[PDB]
Amino acid sequence: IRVFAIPPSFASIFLTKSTKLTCLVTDLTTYDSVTISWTRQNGEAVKTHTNISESHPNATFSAVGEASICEDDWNSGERFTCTVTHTDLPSPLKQTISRPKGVALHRPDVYLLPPAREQLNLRESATITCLVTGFSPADVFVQWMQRGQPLSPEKYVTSAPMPEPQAPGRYFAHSILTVSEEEWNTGETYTCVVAHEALPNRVTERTVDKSTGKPTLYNVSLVMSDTAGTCY
Amino acid sequence: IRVFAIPPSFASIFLTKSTKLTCLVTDLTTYDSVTISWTRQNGEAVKTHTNISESHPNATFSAVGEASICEDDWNSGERFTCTVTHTDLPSPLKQTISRPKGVALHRPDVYLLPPAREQLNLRESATITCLVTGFSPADVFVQWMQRGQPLSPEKYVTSAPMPEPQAPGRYFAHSILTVSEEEWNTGETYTCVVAHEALPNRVTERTVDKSTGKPTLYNVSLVMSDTAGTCY
Amino acid sequence: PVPEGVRLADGPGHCKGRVEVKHQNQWYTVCQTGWSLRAAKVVCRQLGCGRAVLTQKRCNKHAYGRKPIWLSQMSCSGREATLQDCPSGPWGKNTCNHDEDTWVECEDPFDLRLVGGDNLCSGRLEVLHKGVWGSVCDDNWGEKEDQVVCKQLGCGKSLSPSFRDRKCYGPGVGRIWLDNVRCSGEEQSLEQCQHRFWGFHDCTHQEDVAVIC
Amino acid sequence: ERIVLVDNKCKCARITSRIIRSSEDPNEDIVERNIRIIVPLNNRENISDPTSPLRTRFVYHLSDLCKKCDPTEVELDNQIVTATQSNICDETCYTYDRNKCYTAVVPLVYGGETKMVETALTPDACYP
Ligand SMILES: *[C@@H]1O[C@H](CO)[C@@H](O[C@@H]2O[C@H](CO)[C@@H](O)[C@H](O)[C@H]2NC(C)=O)[C@H](O)[C@H]1NC(C)=O
Ligand SMILES: *[C@@H]1O[C@H](CO)[C@@H](O)[C@H](O)[C@H]1NC(C)=O
Ligand SMILES: *[C@@H]1O[C@H](CO)[C@@H](O)[C@H](O)[C@H]1NC(C)=O
Ligand SMILES: [Ca+2]
Ligand SMILES: [Ca+2]
């Protein structure tokens, strides 16, 4: 009764180097092998290795599409559709999916907010928020690394890009990392690596630790050794 | 009544780029033309420009016989001798000359001393000293330059390289450049060019003026800004 | 009885070698007592090389290369363009005291090229100092040196690029020759503009600079 | 009228010296030594390492800041020779350079792709 039409985000093109396409069919009907056929503008059938590997409680089978459409073909902005062939309930579900043509490209101006001292005083956990804000293509991919090795994708929570309030064409996302209190207080540098289309380098990273993020104590020590003598 | 047997020094083989060897016969006895014939180890007469000297105050005949043998003969370490043939007062003199063989090599630590504040209060004749010290083959050439243009040779006097008192192997040599105090008080830049074997690029240039000298009032400002990651 | 064009032969190229002189179609070698870097500057400025560097009065075997010795002695002021401008007044007095010859070594003339472009006057900037074609740095790279480089090749003015065509026109391979090139816009070549020393940079190859004219 | 002795841009230290004419007598004029040092309180010890600890100690050897081993060219009588300007040099520093750009390689994982992409540590200098 519900079929997704998940597009290739810029993460799946920038990292995997192939525009992965899917239309996941969930609990539609009792048909033996749900045939997903990715159809282009010309209508020719590309290689679609349909995967049936999900178990549903209603005994209704599932199908996942697969397309190897190149990046230059997707960036031309054509309307794609998996023409799902149905013999049980034979209604052609021509699901429509296309690139938003002519959208502007505004880079994410990323800030890393350290956890508030009220949440620090709980002595239980610390919530580090990454404020990836003001990005126009609205497909964000933020990855966290703890001082060099990347963190688990289920450890952090990435909010969906909602429209930014004070600016019409911008979108903002939150990346909430819930780490322990004793992990934050040791001073491990937590990085916010965000991947996006709109940057020229396509990847930026901001860093906080206990010392950098919050000015609770600034142990600066300045040494001017010579402060005299001849110089030319 | 005296004779000299000057070898080519590191001055005469660097600023002129030609090893000039002469034995200055100085007013010995009245002869028509004192012939000077430089010789090698085999003993053939090197082609020598035999110049008759001018009228001395003591008016006895003198000659300057220079033969510009190239750098390979002096670098090979071959001794020479000018066979000064005497017909009048027939006593032949075998004035021998050879390069210093097997001497050490230590880098000249050249320093530039500005004129003293006691001396500048007399409003004339500021003396800038180029202390060239720590050079082992004891052949140094010091030239004082103004704005990249060399000064007159009468403006400075370079002392002969005397041995260093504390260090036995090294030597030292002064260079007193006397200039007007009004010239030094305008912040005019004085440059001491010193050339020696042990230097890497074979020439060291030290600059001094009133800006380079010891400051009587420092103006240290340490801007402690938490936002300037780059430089202003 | 006057220079009629000189040459620097019997040496490593046309820029370095023994200096000679020409008069009524006789080639005469030059030997002088009063000879400095001023006469070298006049010799390298007349013949076509970049800048005078070193000048010896070196030894040789006298049987080899016995061109006849230029008896007229000149004392060049330094900024004379040609040996016609040098004072060659005394004609007849023999001044060559010793049987040697004068060995002038000039710098190679400046060849500035835009390599990496699509056969226009564009690409990364490459310069030739001694024998190596190398790039320059962009520490403080402005419009004045942009139009100086564009007018060095005689290919119009700069189009003021916005780093896209500057980045996409080659990373550049070779030793970085010039850093901190600060021009003024009126220099006819990049050698007249001040910079750091030749090859004494502080930047890698990824900090190369391209010029689009 | 002040001249700039050094203008070091990755250790922020602008050393200028001016002979300010404090009187008509040209002997009591004081030679100022302006050392303007901008200390980054948020830059780390290794500025090319995002994961480096925050820098707490800033040490400025002004003998090292005033060093000069770009060899200048002097003109002798028969030669132009490169001249060493100092006997000191024959380096870690605390601030970013405006003319330069610094990069860092971070692991980006989408499943198991582990593409080691690069990161512009400063955004303005790489792509103005
Ligand atoms: C500062 O960090 C950078 C980046 O981690 C270090 O540069 C690395 O140095 C090693 C050893 O030479 C190389 O194998 C890496 O390829 C370098 N990485 C990069 C990105 O250049 C640098 O050595 C560190 N500096 C200090 C003083 O620790
Ligand atoms: C130098 O001192 C003057 C006062 O004499 C002051 O106004 C100026 O700000 C100082 N320079 C710096 C860089 O602080
Ligand atoms: C503060 O900084 C100094 C300077 O290096 C250091 O010696 C000291 O250990 C630091 N103290 C703390 C508590 O960080
Ligand atoms: Ca640069
Ligand atoms: Ca530079």
GROMACS .gro file of C-alpha atoms in nm, chain B residues 45-206:
model
  162
  277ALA     CA    1  11.017   3.113  -1.740
  278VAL     CA    2  10.649   3.201  -1.703
  279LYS     CA    3  10.545   3.482  -1.939
  280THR     CA    4  10.558   3.777  -1.699
  281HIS     CA    5  10.456   4.137  -1.760
  282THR     CA    6  10.764   4.318  -1.627
  283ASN     CA    7  10.662   4.675  -1.544
  284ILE     CA    8  10.918   4.941  -1.454
  285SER     CA    9  10.803   5.137  -1.150
  286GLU     CA   10  10.781   5.516  -1.138
  287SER     CA   11  11.030   5.757  -0.981
  288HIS     CA   12  11.049   5.678  -0.611
  289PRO     CA   13  11.119   5.944  -0.345
  290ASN     CA   14  11.451   5.766  -0.286
  291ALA     CA   15  11.485   5.747  -0.669
  292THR     CA   16  11.643   5.399  -0.685
  293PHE     CA   17  11.512   5.164  -0.954
  294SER     CA   18  11.216   4.938  -0.873
  295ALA     CA   19  11.002   4.700  -1.077
  296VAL     CA   20  10.667   4.522  -1.055
  297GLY     CA   21  10.665   4.193  -1.243
  298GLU     CA   22  10.319   4.035  -1.255
  299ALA     CA   23  10.228   3.710  -1.432
  300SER     CA   24   9.858   3.622  -1.422
  301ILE     CA   25   9.869   3.245  -1.405
  302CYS     CA   26   9.520   3.100  -1.379
  303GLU     CA   27   9.349   2.933  -1.083
  304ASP     CA   28   9.457   2.575  -1.161
  305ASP     CA   29   9.828   2.638  -1.094
  306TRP     CA   30   9.759   2.804  -0.758
  307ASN     CA   31   9.493   2.548  -0.663
  308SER     CA   32   9.725   2.256  -0.744
  309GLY     CA   33   9.975   2.373  -0.482
  310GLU     CA   34  10.286   2.430  -0.693
  311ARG     CA   35  10.558   2.658  -0.559
  312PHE     CA   36  10.698   2.942  -0.770
  313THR     CA   37  11.010   3.160  -0.773
  314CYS     CA   38  11.095   3.475  -0.969
  315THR     CA   39  11.454   3.442  -1.092
  316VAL     CA   40  11.552   3.805  -1.052
  317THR     CA   41  11.868   3.812  -1.263
  318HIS     CA   42  12.120   4.063  -1.130
  319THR     CA   43  12.391   4.199  -1.359
  320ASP     CA   44  12.441   4.510  -1.145
  321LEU     CA   45  12.515   4.388  -0.788
  322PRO     CA   46  12.513   4.024  -0.911
  323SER     CA   47  12.348   3.838  -0.624
  324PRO     CA   48  12.056   3.625  -0.750
  325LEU     CA   49  11.756   3.607  -0.517
  326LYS     CA   50  11.529   3.301  -0.521
  327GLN     CA   51  11.220   3.454  -0.363
  328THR     CA   52  10.995   3.150  -0.324
  329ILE     CA   53  10.614   3.153  -0.298
  330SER     CA   54  10.360   2.877  -0.239
  331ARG     CA   55   9.998   2.834  -0.139
  332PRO     CA   56   9.897   2.732   0.215
  333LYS     CA   57   9.861   2.354   0.190
  334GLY     CA   58   9.640   2.157   0.427
  335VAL     CA   59   9.506   2.447   0.633
  336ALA     CA   60   9.167   2.408   0.798
  337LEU     CA   61   8.835   2.564   0.700
  338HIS     CA   62   8.607   2.739   0.950
  339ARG     CA   63   8.314   2.964   0.863
  340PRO     CA   64   8.355   3.337   0.935
  341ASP     CA   65   8.096   3.445   1.190
  342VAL     CA   66   8.068   3.802   1.066
  343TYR     CA   67   7.897   4.056   1.294
  344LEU     CA   68   7.811   4.420   1.233
  345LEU     CA   69   7.869   4.666   1.517
  346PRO     CA   70   7.693   5.004   1.488
  347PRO     CA   71   7.881   5.316   1.602
  348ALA     CA   72   7.880   5.378   1.975
  349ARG     CA   73   7.640   5.626   2.133
  350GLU     CA   74   7.942   5.788   2.297
  351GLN     CA   75   8.091   5.853   1.952
  352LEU     CA   76   7.773   5.992   1.794
  353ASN     CA   77   7.752   6.270   2.055
  354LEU     CA   78   8.055   6.443   1.896
  355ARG     CA   79   7.834   6.486   1.582
  356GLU     CA   80   8.109   6.376   1.337
  357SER     CA   81   8.288   6.062   1.216
  358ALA     CA   82   8.069   5.764   1.295
  359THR     CA   83   8.277   5.444   1.277
  360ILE     CA   84   8.097   5.123   1.181
  361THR     CA   85   8.292   4.804   1.254
  362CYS     CA   86   8.253   4.483   1.055
  363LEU     CA   87   8.389   4.224   1.297
  364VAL     CA   88   8.480   3.926   1.079
  365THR     CA   89   8.594   3.647   1.311
  366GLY     CA   90   8.636   3.271   1.308
  367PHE     CA   91   8.799   3.211   0.968
  368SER     CA   92   9.077   2.951   0.946
  369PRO     CA   93   9.280   3.010   0.621
  370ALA     CA   94   9.328   3.375   0.737
  371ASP     CA   95   9.259   3.533   0.396
  372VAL     CA   96   8.956   3.762   0.408
  373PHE     CA   97   8.825   4.035   0.179
  374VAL     CA   98   8.584   4.295   0.319
  375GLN     CA   99   8.401   4.549   0.103
  376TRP     CA  100   8.160   4.812   0.237
  377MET     CA  101   7.866   4.893   0.010
  378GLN     CA  102   7.601   5.167  -0.001
  379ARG     CA  103   7.259   5.065  -0.145
  380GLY     CA  104   7.424   4.786  -0.343
  381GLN     CA  105   7.695   5.023  -0.474
  382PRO     CA  106   8.047   4.978  -0.332
  383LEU     CA  107   8.207   5.250  -0.123
  384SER     CA  108   8.542   5.414  -0.182
  385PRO     CA  109   8.843   5.211  -0.059
  386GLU     CA  110   8.963   5.513   0.141
  387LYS     CA  111   8.637   5.525   0.339
  388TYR     CA  112   8.718   5.204   0.529
  389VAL     CA  113   9.032   5.039   0.661
  390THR     CA  114   9.037   4.660   0.692
  391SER     CA  115   9.288   4.527   0.943
  392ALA     CA  116   9.517   4.237   0.861
  393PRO     CA  117   9.385   3.903   0.992
  394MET     CA  118   9.535   3.860   1.338
  395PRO     CA  119   9.499   3.527   1.523
  396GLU     CA  120   9.207   3.487   1.759
  397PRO     CA  121   9.310   3.513   2.127
  398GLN     CA  122   9.085   3.243   2.271
  399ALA     CA  123   9.050   3.007   1.973
  400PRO     CA  124   9.395   2.902   1.843
  401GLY     CA  125   9.304   2.785   1.493
  402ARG     CA  126   9.064   3.063   1.396
  403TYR     CA  127   9.147   3.424   1.308
  404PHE     CA  128   8.968   3.759   1.309
  405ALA     CA  129   8.979   4.084   1.115
  406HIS     CA  130   8.822   4.425   1.178
  407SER     CA  131   8.681   4.669   0.924
  408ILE     CA  132   8.649   5.027   1.048
  409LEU     CA  133   8.430   5.229   0.810
  410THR     CA  134   8.434   5.597   0.902
  411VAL     CA  135   8.129   5.792   0.781
  412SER     CA  136   7.968   6.122   0.871
  413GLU     CA  137   7.732   6.118   1.169
  414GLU     CA  138   7.465   6.304   0.970
  415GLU     CA  139   7.482   6.019   0.718
  416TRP     CA  140   7.422   5.755   0.986
  417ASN     CA  141   7.154   5.958   1.166
  418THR     CA  142   6.922   5.949   0.863
  419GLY     CA  143   6.898   5.571   0.887
  420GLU     CA  144   7.121   5.513   0.586
  421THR     CA  145   7.179   5.143   0.525
  422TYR     CA  146   7.541   5.027   0.537
  423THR     CA  147   7.624   4.682   0.401
  424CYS     CA  148   7.943   4.487   0.475
  425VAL     CA  149   8.028   4.234   0.203
  426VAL     CA  150   8.276   3.975   0.329
  427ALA     CA  151   8.414   3.699   0.106
  428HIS     CA  152   8.594   3.386   0.226
  429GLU     CA  153   8.656   3.024   0.124
  430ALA     CA  154   8.457   2.856   0.401
  431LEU     CA  155   8.127   3.031   0.330
  432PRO     CA  156   7.861   2.832   0.136
  433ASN     CA  157   7.776   3.100  -0.120
  434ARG     CA  158   8.130   3.246  -0.065
  435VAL     CA  159   7.997   3.599   0.016
  436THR     CA  160   7.813   3.720   0.327
  437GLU     CA  161   7.624   4.050   0.338
  438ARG     CA  162   7.525   4.209   0.669
   0.00000   0.00000   0.00000
